[PDB]
RNA sequence: UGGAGAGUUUGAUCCUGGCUCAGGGUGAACGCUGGCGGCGUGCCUAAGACAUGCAAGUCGUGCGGGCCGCGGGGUUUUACUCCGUGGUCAGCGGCGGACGGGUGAGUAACGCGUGGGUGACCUACCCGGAAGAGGGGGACAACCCGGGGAAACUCGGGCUAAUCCCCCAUGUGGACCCGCCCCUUGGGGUGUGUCCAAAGGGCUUUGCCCGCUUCCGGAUGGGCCCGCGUCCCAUCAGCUAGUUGGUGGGGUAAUGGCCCACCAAGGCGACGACGGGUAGCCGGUCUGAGAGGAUGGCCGGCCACAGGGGCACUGAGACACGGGCCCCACUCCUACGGGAGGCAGCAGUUAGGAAUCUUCCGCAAUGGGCGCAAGCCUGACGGAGCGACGCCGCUUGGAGGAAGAAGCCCUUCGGGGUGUAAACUCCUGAACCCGGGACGAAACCCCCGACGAGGGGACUGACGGUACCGGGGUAAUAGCGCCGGCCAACUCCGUGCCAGCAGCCGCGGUAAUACGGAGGGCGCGAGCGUUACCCGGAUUCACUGGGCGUAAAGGGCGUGUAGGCGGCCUGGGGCGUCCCAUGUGAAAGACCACGGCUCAACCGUGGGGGAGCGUGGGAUACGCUCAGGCUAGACG
């Protein structure tokens, strides 16, 4: 089942995740299908969360299934805001 | 020791004995139908052919055959029967076959 | 760690006068003023024509001992300078000249480069506010390099920035003796520097 | 795109199958000089429609037999053993350069 | 934006040519030496053998029970029995156990790479759409009873639930035979015939949640097929009989000799078949001016394996590392009948070895499985530990301080050197002490709102009391190699072709800058040096970029097969070749910029380039090809 989750890419004590689309069965750091955002947990810089909701909205439209955290971030990025 | 998913092997055996049987019925009846079409016995041959069709479609109902396998069976069966009957110079007497 | 050990002897070996100290390497002392010849037993015997190697060797040694930086660091810097756009020779000098310790030495906060190093090490120096204690830190154009508020009362720093009243500063620098601030205007060029060095020779030394 | 190939039928000794000798040129990866090189494909011929010497086109196809993965698409130019001739002679030289020897 | 050469054949010279050295590199090892931190990295040998613990489960919202207990009923008492509830245990059932983790034995192969094909296919869970769930029947565990075994374990009888299994119906639809239509390998449609559905559970209970059935579509993952590419030996030259093709059949999700029966007699090979040797392949990596050479370790992708060999079962998926069966070897238990194991998972032991770590902490974060959820499992993972093993950063101090101490060394005995070095004065102040103390963590969940959007609230960190911040504060590790030339750095003494040095030339037989020490010196520095191996220098396998009269090298000569090469003019094609557009060329790494950690190492974001291959379009000089013509080559 394809998902939208976080992949570890920082470095020891310097975590940085890539919001990603990948089959649930892949390693968490293995070959994903598509990168669709990035996230710096520690906000070391102003731009610590980008998301490209256009694509998110797409994967979700095709059965992508976000992690509880992936969704939290996708949400924060307005991926679900309908207004 | 003892990894309780020993239950899995337990189940597998039962499932095996289950499919094992359904497939025998299938084979048997198929032959039966084929053998008859061969004889030229129209009615009965076709009649049996229907059970065969039925059990096949039914085996595909659960996971003993499913889809294609069953489709392949049905075609090869109706195939042989049709041919054997025609060759025998026998008129399809009702039941089965979209003749 | 960095060299350590008699310095006004490297001056002697290198021939040229390196200023590895402050006030003294100006007094009528810095050995080059007394015995301007290499150290050791044979320092005074005739010198044989140096080999192309010796030539290139010494030149590097000289340029390098001036900034009292190791061979490891010195080399890496060189390779960087070598890789960038623009005349390696100049560029290399620019990078060495951008070391924090050097700039602090250039602004007069310290009498010598060594002293500058120790100032930075003991957090007496600041870069754009935040304090930095890495003698190898690379100052970029625009950075303000001041003395520590806390340290602004250190006799030494007083004595030094005092003698700075009057003294001019490199055209790539600007000093505010007032608030003990200094500013890195731009990367010095080869024309700005007056090192007793033949950069062409150093570049060649690494060619081999 | 199912690959399409052009060669000569160097053998119609089989049932519904013809051997097509496809040739191809190309620069040597290191020496650069252009070098010829060839290969034989066993193309399917359902209607025994192709004879020895035809220059046919072979089309990539769904497996027909082990060894058969191409079908004769269309004839390009009939008869011309000048090509088949080459092939056969090349073959004839073989039975020779083994324990004793070949020809000239 | 890129390219150094030197020593050595001689009495000397020039050439040829091999050897040797300076450089870079490493999963290193050994020697001497060793202070701090960050990041990375660490059995290369026995894919040897393994103690012990841990490492895959989860659902009471699918089902019925056993055991232990509490409460309330029907009982006048007793016997007997009904309901509720706590704990506990499996069992039935489901989804997961095919992922994740390990390793590289095997494999020279559609294994891998790259580009394509599938009208020859599959895909649990997830998403969109269409339609549906009516009635009835059964069984087996658990449990109860009896038997056999040392144990492992097993046999028989009886009862029972379900989302367990079966039958009938409904047929939206779908499957099969046949026909017809459109498409064109088995694609899509349509008609008659036959055939095939489902299961329930939870409630804030006439509705909402979780789930179930058939079908179409999507998404993801995958099978199979094809072109091209992929080491050494021809002292391996012929190989093949399921072998090559055909017809029919089996088998599969599906093509196919994959398998079988019959038929045909084919298929492959010097463009190197067959055989032998070696080896997981790749992104990459190291080196190199490049072309190339070498390599595949960390990380990512694919393959293969799970003590050795074979086999299938169950499943959407396995021929299934921690599932099953058989054979083999080895180990353990046994009352000798018969049983039990498989660390190439984490850590660890032992063996081999020059050599490769903790039986650590945590599930807080990221990811995964099950669950409505709370939550449970997770040696995956995030961390910490050990090793200068690597890389980056940092300290052992800073300024002053004699025409110059002492000691040691040299001397032409005048003096010279170690040396501003020290002593010494002043200055700063790593260590270390005290105080504060974190980002990483906001979701799941609760409430408002429609269980949506949105808004509010609550719980939670192993690392760590660590980082970082503030106050206080001590002058506070230096070693290793080398000094004849290559090659930077010279003297005294000892020794006497000895003892020894040695990468090459060579040095030592009483004046040794070459041996050993000392003084001095050069190089690099928590490192330095050695040994090993790769690339370089080596245009010394020469494509870039070499040669063969006498240096190694022309075949003893010819005839001639394959093959390589091909005069002049015109035309057609447009295969080579050239051009444009387009698809592909993952991520990582590499190049550039900006940015995060005080710098850097390391890491984040963005940008740029990129061979090769697919498709579309175009050009035609040259090579090609076809057709025509010529006479200068050739032949008569
Ligand atoms: Mg279970
Ligand atoms: Mg440059
Ligand atoms: Mg000589
Ligand atoms: Mg000579
Ligand atoms: Mg030579
Ligand atoms: Mg109970
Ligand atoms: Mg499963
Ligand atoms: Mg082989
Ligand atoms: Mg291949
Ligand atoms: Mg499943
Ligand atoms: Mg019974
Ligand atoms: Mg069922
Ligand atoms: Mg209908
Ligand atoms: Mg029915
Ligand atoms: Mg075969
Ligand atoms: Mg060939
Ligand atoms: Mg191997
Ligand atoms: Mg080269
Ligand atoms: Mg080339
Ligand atoms: Mg399955
Ligand atoms: Mg399965
Ligand atoms: Mg299963
Ligand atoms: Mg299944
Ligand atoms: Mg299973
Ligand atoms: Mg399954
Ligand atoms: Mg399943
Ligand atoms: Mg399953
Ligand atoms: Mg099955
Ligand atoms: Mg299933
Ligand atoms: Mg398993
Ligand atoms: Mg195991
Ligand atoms: Mg966890
Ligand atoms: Mg989780
Ligand atoms: Mg001093
Ligand atoms: Mg010298
Ligand atoms: Mg002796
Ligand atoms: Mg002597
Ligand atoms: Mg020597
Ligand atoms: Mg000596
Ligand atoms: Mg260092
Ligand atoms: Mg070469
Ligand atoms: Mg050449
Ligand atoms: Mg030569
Ligand atoms: Mg000769
Ligand atoms: Mg001759
Ligand atoms: Mg010829
Ligand atoms: Mg020509
Ligand atoms: Mg063309
Ligand atoms: Mg392209
Ligand atoms: Mg920065
Ligand atoms: Zn001086």
DSSP per position, C127-192: ESSSB---TT-B--TT-BEEE-TGGGG-HHHHHHHHHTTT----TTEEEETTTTEEEE-SPPPTTT
In degrees rounded to 5, what are phi and psi of residue C97?
-70, -15
DSSP state, residue A49: E
Helices (H), D9-97: 81-94
Nucleotides of E under 7 A from a protein CB: 3-4, 22, 35, 38-40, 56-58, 90-94, 96-97, 99-101, 115-127, 165-168, 174-178, 185, 191-198, 214, 218-221, 224-229, 237-238, 244-247, 249-258, 264-271, 291-292, 299-302, 313-317, 320, 322-324, 341, 365-369, 380-384, 392-404, 409-410, 416-421, 426-430, 439-444, 452-454, 471, 475, 477-478, 486-491, 519-526, 543, 559-565, 575-577, 586, 591-593, 595-599, 602-606, 614-615, 623
| Other CB atoms within 10 A of residue B10 CB | 9
Residue C6 contacts strand E, CB under 7 A? yes
Domain-wise residue ranges, chain D: 1-104
Of B56, B95, B99, the closest CA to residue B75 belongs to B56
42-71 of chain A touching strand E, CB 7 A cut-off: 42-45, 50, 61-65, 67-71
Distance C169 CA to E472 C1' (A): 37
Instruction: Tell how far CA B82 is from the center of its chain.
Output: 16
**Residues ≥6 apart with Cβ < 8 Å to B81:** B33, B34, B37, B45, B46, B49, B97
D47 Cα to the center of ligand 36, angstroms = 101
DSSP state, residue C86: S
Of A35, A65, A66, A67, the closest CA to residue A51 belongs to A35
**Structural domain that includes position B69:** 1-99
In degrees rounded to 5, what are phi and psi of residue C167?
-45, 135
Could you tell me the two tokens for C126?
Answer: 């600041």
Residue C131 contacts strand E, CB under 7 A? yes
Nucleotide with C1' nearest the D6 CA: E575
User: Do residues C104 and C147 make contact, with C-beta atoms less than 8 angstroms apart?
Assistant: no
Domain count, chain B: 1
User: Do residues D90 and D14 make contact, with C-beta atoms less than 8 angstroms apart?
Assistant: no
Q: What is the CATH number of the domain that holds B5?
A: 1.20.58.110
Q: Which domains does chain C have, with CATH numbers?
A: 1-96+194-208 (1.10.1050.10), 97-193 (3.10.290.10)
CATH number, domain D1-104, options 2.40.50.140, 3.30.70.20, 2.60.110.10, 2.40.110.10? 2.40.50.140
Q: For chain B, give the number of residues.
A: 99
Residue D49 contacts strand E, CB under 7 A? no
Residue D37 contacts strand E, CB under 7 A? yes
Could you tell me the two tokens for C109?
Answer: 């906060």
Method used to determine the 3D structure: X-ray
D35 Cα to the center of ligand 18, angstroms = 28
Q: Which domains does chain A have, with CATH numbers?
A: 1-83 (3.30.1320.10)
């Amino acid at each position: 089942m394809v998902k939208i989750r976080l992949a570890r890419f920082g470095s020891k004590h310097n975590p940085h995740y890539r919001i990603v689309v990948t089959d649930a069965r892949r390693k968490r750091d293995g070959k994903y299908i598509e990168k669709i955002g990035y996230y710096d947990p520690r906000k070391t810089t102003p731009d610590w969360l980008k998301v490209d909701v256009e694509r998110a909205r797409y994967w979700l439209s095709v059965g992508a299934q976000p992690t509880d955290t992936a969704r939290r971030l996708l949400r924060q990025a307005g991926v679900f805001r309908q207004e | 020791r003892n990894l309780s998913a020993l239950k899995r092997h337990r189940q597998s055996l039962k499932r095996r004995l289950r499919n094992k049987a359904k497939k025998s019925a299938i084979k048997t009846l198929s032959k039966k139908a084929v053998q008859l079409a061969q004889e030229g016995k129209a009615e009965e041959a076709l009649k049996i052919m229907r059970k065969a069709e039925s059990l096949i479609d039914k085996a595909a109902k659960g996971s003993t055959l499913h889809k294609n396998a069953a489709a392949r069976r049905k075609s090869r069966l109706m195939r042989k029967v049709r041919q054997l009957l025609e060759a025998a110079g026998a008129p399809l007497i009702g039941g089965g076959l979209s003749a | 760690g960095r060299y350590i050990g008699p310095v006004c002897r490297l001056c002697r070996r290198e021939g040229v006068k390196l200023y590895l100290k402050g006030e003294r390497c100006y007094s009528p002392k810095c050995a080059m003023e007394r015995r301007p010849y290499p150290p050791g037993q044979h320092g005074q015997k005739r010198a044989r024509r140096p080999s192309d190697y010796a030539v290139r060797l010494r030149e590097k040694q000289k340029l390098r001992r001036i900034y009292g930086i190791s061979e490891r660091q010195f080399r890496n810097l060189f390779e960087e300078a070598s890789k960038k756009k623009g005349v390696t020779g100049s560029v290399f000098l620019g990078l060495l000249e951008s070391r924090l310790d050097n700039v602090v030495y250039r602004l007069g906060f310290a009498v010598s480069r060594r002293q500058a190093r120790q100032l930075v090490r003991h957090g007496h120096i600041t870069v754009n506010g935040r304090r930095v204690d890495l003698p190898s830190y690379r100052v970029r154009p625009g950075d303000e390099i001041a003395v520590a508020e806390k340290s602004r009362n250190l006799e030494l720093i007083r004595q030094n920035l005092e003698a700075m009243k009057g003294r001019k500063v490199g055209p790539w620098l600007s000093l505010d003796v007032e608030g003990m601030k200094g500013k890195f205007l731009r990367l010095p060029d080869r024309e700005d520097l007056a090192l007793p060095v033949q950069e062409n020779l150093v570049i060649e030394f690494y060619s081999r | 795109p199912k690959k399409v190939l052009t060669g000569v039928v160097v053998s119609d000794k089989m049932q519904k199958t013809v051997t097509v000798l496809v040739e191809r040129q190309f620069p040597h990866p290191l020496y650069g000089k252009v070098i010829k090189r060839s290969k034989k494909y066993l193309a399917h011929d359902p209607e025994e429609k192709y004879k020895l010497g035809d220059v046919v086109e072979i089309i990539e196809s769904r497996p027909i037999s082990k060894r058969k993965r191409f079908r004769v698409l269309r004839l390009v130019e009939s008869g011309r053993m000048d090509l088949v001739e080459k092939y056969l002679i090349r073959r004839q030289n073989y039975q020779s350069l083994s324990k004793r020897g070949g020809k000239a």
